[PDB]
Amino acid sequence: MFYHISLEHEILLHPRYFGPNLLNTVKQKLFTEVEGTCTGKYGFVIAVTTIDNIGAGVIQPGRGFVLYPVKYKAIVFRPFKGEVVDAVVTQVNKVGLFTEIGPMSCFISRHSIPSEMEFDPNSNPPCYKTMDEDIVIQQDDEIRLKIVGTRVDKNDIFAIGSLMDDYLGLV
Amino acid sequence: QANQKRITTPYMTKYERARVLGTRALQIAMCAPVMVELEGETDPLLIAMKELKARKIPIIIRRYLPDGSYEDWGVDELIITD
């Protein structure tokens, strides 16, 4: 679930970057560092829309690095518990359902999956199908799911979905 | 505080001079661009000294008043004793 908020970040600049394009170097460092990272509080950082303010660069005593606090507006992807966001399943296997919500990778175990869906490897793509074959989920197919929880592992977030609720799944 | 109504010594203190010189020398030793034209100067301390004499060190001295306020003085805005 994407969001647009204001974040805070601190950049340490080497003295080699002093001179012309100093503020440009600060902006480039901010883009390189902040974009692509994910934090538990704010979720994945999609991109930065605008950089609000670069604070006064405080020269740290010793080690000569200048510290520039940066205020900026960035797009942040943040799944929440119980939220239904349309997703795309990337992989399907017996262990569970592997789905993707933009930058968010979601795993859906079969325990929460309704029993109408069964695993049939005999299909050309290894996927899940029902006996009536009305409901078929394969690669890159868009399906809806609700996030039951969120967990972060090694600065990377991983969520778990579920298909318990009605009017959810294939559209 | 703003540039106007600064109530502090217009003179750079010896402590400010020492710390500015050391910081600028460290910056020069870490490949910072030199604001002044150096004539065969390889010692970062001496280059920082000649920048101080040239009013070229790109450092703002933030003077904290005991009530929590501060005044930002550029090195060029201060008059050096030497």
């Binding site: 080699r16 002093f18 001179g19 012309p20 394009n21 100093l22 503020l23 006064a56 660069g57 405080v58 020269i59 005593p61 200048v66 | 203190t13 010896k14 402590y15 400010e16 020492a18 710390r19 500015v20 910081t23 910072a32 661009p33 030199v34 604001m35 034209e37 070229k56 060190i57 790109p58 450092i59 703002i60 001295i61 933030r62 003077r63 904290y64 501060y70 930002d72 550029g74 060029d76």
Partner: peptide, 21 residues
């Protein structure tokens, strides 16, 4: 104390006059 009672800031405008960058 002295050399510790104040704080140093980098002036970005004044950096826009540097040589070997």
């Amino acid at each position: 104390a002295g050399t510790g009672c104040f704080d140093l800031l980098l002036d970005a405008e004044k950096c826009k006059y540097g040589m070997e960058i």
